[PDB]
Amino acid sequence: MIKIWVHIKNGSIYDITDIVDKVSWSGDYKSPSRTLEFSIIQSSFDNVFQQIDIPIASTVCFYVDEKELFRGMIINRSKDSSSNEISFVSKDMGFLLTQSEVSYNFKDKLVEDIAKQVFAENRLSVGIIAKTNVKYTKMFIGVNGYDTIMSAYTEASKKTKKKYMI
Amino acid sequence: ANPINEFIGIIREEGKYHNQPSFFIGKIKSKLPDLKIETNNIILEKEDILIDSWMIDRQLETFDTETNQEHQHEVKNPFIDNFESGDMVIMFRIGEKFAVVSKLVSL
Amino acid sequence: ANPINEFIGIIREEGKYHNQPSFFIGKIKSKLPDLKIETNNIILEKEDILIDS
């Protein structure tokens, strides 16, 4: 049992499970965001098969066995005239980290505090942050938040013999 | 959009990811004895600054001449220059601290 | 390992092959009249040095 729901800008909510043709869900350890791809059937030749429209930058939710696994924004949209299909590409919220670009001056700071400050500067909600009592000192000029956090946690990993991810 | 041209542009853009600027430009906020420099929304302290030797040397207040005719004279140094707030400097980044090379004025 | 990310990393690394450092740091071994400078396990003589006036 998989369900897909779409929230449109005006306030309408649709359940589009009966129209979906294919679903894909994937991630990699070298990027902070996960991706979701799906297709629906919409025919312009036939009046019966015309569907609703889902504009760019609307929220899509993915459920499996009554559990929410994905929530993200619609980024790409494509329509082929030969085939009766419309394709969508969605991305997690995690790509918001790489948009930020700030300059910091860190002296003898805990890595957890560094991550907390980076998340707080560009306003973002924090669920939980791994704890490590390793102090770091660095000067960041023109670097992403994602790169800042990853560099600090790599320096912590040089001592904890661990690996970390966002 | 021809895909080959887009690929070439992508290569040209991604080749520049690791590059860092050659030099930095900074503005002073406090006079030379307690020097403070601002660049890229960052204020540098004396722990973070390496300076040219001549800048320190030229702030000598006074020096004396040799004796002759059983008398001496005291000459005040006219080359003393303490940077004022708002001046421009050229600086190079070495590890974790910046090195101040010279001060630039429009002639 | 996603191949696209590996390709992007390969591009970023190979784009830096021809780059050269902006400046060098060196320490003197002999006084100014006969100046000698050591950098990168290389000792410079007076034939190899241009100095500020």
Partner: peptide
């Protein structure tokens, strides 16, 4: 023309990955 389609797909994938952020 196969090379053109392959290049188009590769370019689209690289652009999406750039938007998503790559470490």
């Amino acid at each position: 023309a196969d090379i053109e389609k392959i290049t188009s797909k590769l370019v689209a994938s690289i652009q999406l990955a750039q938007l998503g952020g790559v470490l």
